[PDB]
Amino acid sequence: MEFLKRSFAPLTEKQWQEIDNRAREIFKTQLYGRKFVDVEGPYGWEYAAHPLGEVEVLSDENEVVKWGLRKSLPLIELRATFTLDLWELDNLERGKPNVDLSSLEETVRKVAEFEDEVIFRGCEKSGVKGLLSFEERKIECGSTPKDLLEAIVRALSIFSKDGIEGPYTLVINTDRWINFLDDEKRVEECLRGGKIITTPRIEDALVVSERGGDFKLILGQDLSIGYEDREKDAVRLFITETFTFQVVNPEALILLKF
Amino acid sequence: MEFLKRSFAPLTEKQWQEIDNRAREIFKTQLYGRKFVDVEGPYGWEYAAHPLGEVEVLSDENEVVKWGLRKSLPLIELRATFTLDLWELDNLERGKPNVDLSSLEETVRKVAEFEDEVIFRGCEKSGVKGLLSFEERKIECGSTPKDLLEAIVRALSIFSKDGIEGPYTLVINTDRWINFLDDEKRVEECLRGGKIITTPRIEDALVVSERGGDFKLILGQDLSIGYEDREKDAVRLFITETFTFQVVNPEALILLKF
Amino acid sequence: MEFLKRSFAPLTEKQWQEIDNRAREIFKTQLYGRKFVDVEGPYGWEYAAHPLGEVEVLSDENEVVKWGLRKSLPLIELRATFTLDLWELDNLERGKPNVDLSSLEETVRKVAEFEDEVIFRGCEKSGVKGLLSFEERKIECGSTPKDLLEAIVRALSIFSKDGIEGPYTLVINTDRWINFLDDEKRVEECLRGGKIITTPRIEDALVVSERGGDFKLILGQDLSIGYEDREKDAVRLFITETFTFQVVNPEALILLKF
């Protein structure tokens, strides 16, 4: 990882270990997307496109030679920077255990919010599609604590129509989960071993499968931390990665508008 | 399988694997009949009758020599054809994962519907009998969510009268299952380890056993896919098999008219 | 090479060998570009982009997170088709040595013309640059048979100014080579072991080096021949590849306008 200029920063290694261990936990908890979607292995730092397979024809018709341009998806790279003071980072070697890191977490939350917004609603500039854009997969639901049990069965019938099988899971808003609270074992038994996930991002529910191979995530470099500069008395660091995301089968996904 | 002219089709083997894997799943999910009935092994492509055992006498009475013709059941063979384009099937070798197969599934559903209609109501031309034709095995049921628990017990008594035993199962319409929804563990305990199956074909319920040997299915050739022709730019394929079905004991079967 | 549907064509292998051997020679003679430029190895049939290294920034300024899209070069794929009769292709097995192939060569010339036009003048849709577009590398020349000897020296001085060294070569129009014909050993000695190449494409001369690494050619699949169809009595075939081209150092190249 030589492109991360790590050996040129005035910090002993213990402070590096502390910073990494503090960031990893918020990434483990705050990324909802990685729980069901699938992940393809790391490639490198310079991989710069992914192939679809199609071809676009630009030539005329009455020609002896014909030609066209292949198509692909270009990755995304991001970078965020923050500042940390040196006296407080140095108080660690004297013995204090609860050192103060109060600007790391603030940006560590914004990174995750941005990524989840991309996965759930998509950005048109890069030409991606979001899970809330396949509109024609809709059913209806109610409000009384019994309507949910009915909607789950009516959805598994449509799954059974096609070839989708395997374990199922439900993804629901947090505030709506209050009304249906009094019974939970019935919901878990109707899913036939399913799991419930509650999130604050979306405003309704949706139902998905978990057999494998329907949603893919392409990573060039995982999230990493590195050095930038030395301002006056406060060191400056950054965090970065490169990624993209594709949805293969629009059939293993049902949106339950309330 | 040389009678399936497979080596004379302009497709590399990867496309064959893709097509087989796409069809197998819909067959695994959409065939309700195969779940409880029993299946006898494959024989061959030219087996053309099955023996009952009876004899029909055609001669007169005052003769020194008497003769008659044996009786049997003749199989059924079916064939369905569809067309697939070549440019889209070729986009697979360039790398695209979500190739388009939108006429395979349409007929793959009609085949299953036809077969289940034969098993459940029978065709008079071939002289078969359907599970909804043994009328004299009837009881009565109600609508309140408690009536089902009563009907199950009243049915197991009549099973206990004869020699039928072993695990039991219930087969029910999908739309009716909505009313009796609030309690499910009681139904499962009264069956003493039974299972519930919901289907959209029939309009009421019925109760069967699962010990083994009461319902048989005779297969000559399992469902298979093969080549027919090359029209202009779109290849053409077909799907086929041969089968028949018999019901031995009309006693391990109870119909609950609502 | 299974994507080239070769085993499904009604031709014995000897005719395949004959056709390949007839095409290879015209490709060996008619491609001027491959003589000095360098070639990078074959990758595959689905490689679909090449990375430059740059990054384009699209976000605003006053944001906590910043993002941008990486850039690349997309390949080119081409396909050309022709028809060959069967009676004449069959006269080969009886013994005739000079069989008639009179539509193969006609398109085999157009393919090469198209490719050389791309290398020498570039196509704006794919965003390439041609050797005749770096205008600011110009000098002047004359007409008398002595002016060429002067221009070569005046060009090698400018090469010596920078780091360019190694063997040199000259590329010249065919019709102009008539005037300077009477002396050739002097030109060859001033190049200090150089070589002269005469072409009918360009309208003037230019001087290049040959040390290695200044001009690159990226190939996905080399030129290949395959089967398409069977019309009535005349089989139909095609020829294809995928490529792109880049110019690294605009300094090892001098254009001598007459």
Ligand SMILES: Cc1cc2nc3c(=O)[nH]c(=O)nc-3n(C[C@H](O)[C@H](O)[C@H](O)CO)c2cc1C
């Ligand atoms: C007793 C004492 C200890 C200090 N220790 C540190 C230290 O470990 N790191 C630091 O950046 N500044 C430290 N400072 C402050 C620093 O030496 C001084 O204020 C400079 O002017 C800050 O750039 C210390 C100051 C005092 C009086």
Ligand SMILES: Cc1cc2nc3c(=O)[nH]c(=O)nc-3n(C[C@H](O)[C@H](O)[C@H](O)CO)c2cc1C
């Ligand atoms: C660049 C290009 C690539 C093509 N590739 C294919 C192909 O792989 N399979 C195909 O059936 N037709 C292909 N076609 C179309 C086909 O060669 C031509 O339109 C015939 O007339 C179709 O029968 C292609 C056409 C172009 C311009």
Ligand SMILES: Cc1cc2nc3c(=O)[nH]c(=O)nc-3n(C[C@H](O)[C@H](O)[C@H](O)CO)c2cc1C
């Ligand atoms: C003696 C004889 C030999 C022939 N041999 C060939 C042959 O090798 N290939 C062919 O395509 N047609 C051949 N033809 C022509 C072909 O059999 C016939 O004209 C069909 O109607 C052409 O499609 C032959 C015709 C004759 C009279």
